[PDB]
Design a protein around this ligand. Structure first.
Ligand SMILES: [Ca+2]
Ligand SMILES: [Ca+2]
Ligand SMILES: [Ca+2]
Ligand SMILES: [Ca+2]
Ligand SMILES: [Ca+2]
Ligand code: NA
Length: 223
């Protein structure tokens, strides 16, 4: 009949999932997101090689993760999209039940791996209408800043220019300077494309357009 408590074959479980993973995805056993986490529950009332027909259940995160419902070997699958930028680690217990007695609970930890799922976002408060005086190389034009909430290289931001790359320079902290002496009598305005690109292997970028006005030096004072 049913006098032996079911039990898991390992003392704990560590899982890994990429945040971009679709609902339905199986949780992996290692950080390389290859082979699955296998959760095996046995019960000595049942001859080996036979499915002990156990009920496995989680103590928390029951809207986020579920266990496959049959089999000697069970897997964990995603119920809803996860987000590393909101929560990176899940910890909960799983328990097996044979209809009469429970197993000891086992601790499961899952790490959500980062996807490069965010582009840099420009700070919307830094001015986009800028001025600079003509006839001065290395003159400060303006400041931009972008931040990227992804992890490590996926969240590191690099700046470049999308146009006028012989006229302006941008620094690694978002400061724009003239490369050369501007000349208002040649052109009094520049619509400068600034690019913020992350450090990902598969990079993402964003752009901003800056409205630069060239200020006059009275022509009587230009040498
Ligand atoms: Ca049993
Ligand atoms: Ca990113
Ligand atoms: Ca991310
Ligand atoms: Ca001039
Ligand atoms: Ca002038
Ligand atoms: Na995310």
């Amino acid at each position: 009949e049913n006098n032996q408590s079911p039990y898991f074959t390992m003392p704990s479980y560590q899982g890994y999932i990429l945040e971009s993973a679709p609902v339905g995805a199986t949780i992996s056993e290692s950080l390389n997101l290859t082979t699955p986490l296998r959760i095996v529950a046995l019960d000595k009332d049942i001859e080996d090689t036979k499915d002990p027909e156990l009920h496995l259940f989680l103590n928390d995160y029951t809207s986020v993760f579920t266990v496959t419902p049959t089999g000697i070997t069970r897997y964990l699958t995603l119920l809803q999209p996860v987000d590393r930028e909101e929560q990176q680690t899940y910890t909960f217990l799983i328990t097996a039940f044979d209809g009469v007695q429970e197993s000891e609970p086992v601790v499961v930890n899952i790490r959500v791996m980062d996807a490069n799922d965010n582009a840099p976002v420009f700070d919307p408060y830094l001015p986009r209408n800028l001025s600079v005086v003509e006839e001065e190389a290395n003159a400060f034009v303006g400041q931009v800043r972008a931040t990227d909430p992804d992890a490590g290289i996926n969240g590191q931001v690099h700046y470049s220019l999308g146009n006028f790359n012989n006229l302006f320079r941008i620094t690694s902290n978002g400061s724009i300077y003239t490369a050369v002496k501007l000349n208002r009598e040649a052109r009094d305005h520049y619509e400068l494309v600034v690019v913020a690109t992350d450090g990902a292997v598969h990079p993402r970028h964003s752009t901003l357009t800056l409205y630069i006005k060239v200020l006059d030096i009275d022509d009587n004072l230009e040498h």
